[PDB]
Ligand binder design. Structure first.
Ligand SMILES: CCCCCCCCCCCC
Ligand SMILES: CCCCCCCCCCCC
Lengths: 86, 86
C-alpha cells in the first residue's frame, strides 16, 4: 500500500518494457523483414537485465523498509548478476 | 519562487547558449560559406552537453531543496551521461 508511492516509476517502466517487447514481437511476426539473429537476442538481453534490476531494487526497498530479518542485502544482487550472466 | 535565487545564472547561460545556437544557425543560413561537417556537429554536441548538465543540476537542486522522496540522486546523472553518449 504505502510502498507503492516510492516505486511507481519502477512498475511503470517494467510495464512499458513488457509492452514494447510484445509490440516488437508482433512487429517481427508481421512481415518478418528482419533477421532474428544478434540484434533481437541483444534486445532480449537488455530488457531482461533492466527488468531484473528493477525487481532487485524493489526487493531491496521492501526488505529495507519492512523488515531486515531473514534476508541479507547484496545476496539478491549476487543472484541478479548470476542470472544475467547465465 | 525562492529556488530561482540560487539558479539564476544557470537559466541565464542556458538562454544565452540557445540564443547563440539560433544566431549561428542563421549565420550559416546566410551565405553558407562554411561546411556543415565535423565542426558544426561538435558545436551542437557541446551545447547539448552543457544544457543537459545545467538541467541535471537544476533537477538535483530542486530534489535536494524541496523533497528527497521518490527521486534517487545520481540516477539523473546516469540518464544525462546516457543521453550525451547516445
Ligand atoms: C544471415 C547473416 C546474419 C549475420 C549476423 C551477424 C551477427 C554478428 C554477431 C557479432 C557478435 C560479436
Ligand atoms: C569537404 C571536406 C570535408 C572534410 C571534413 C573533415 C572532418 C574530419 C573529422 C575527424 C574526426 C576525428
Amino acid at each position: 500500500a504505502e510502498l507503492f508511492t516510492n516505486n511507481a516509476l519502477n512498475l511503470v517502466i517494467i510495464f512499458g518494457s513488457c509492452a514494447a517487447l510484445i509490440l516488437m514481437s508482433f512487429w517481427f511476426r508481421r512481415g518478418n523483414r528482419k533477421r532474428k539473429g544478434f540484434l533481437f537476442h541483444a534486445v532480449q538481453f537488455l530488457i531482461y537485465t533492466i527488468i531484473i534490476s528493477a525487481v532487485g531494487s524493489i526487493i531491496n526497498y521492501v526488505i529495507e523498509n519492512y523488515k531486515l530479518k531473514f534476508i541479507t542485502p547484496g545476496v539478491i544482487d549476487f543472484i541478479c548478476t548470476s542470472l544475467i550472466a547465465v
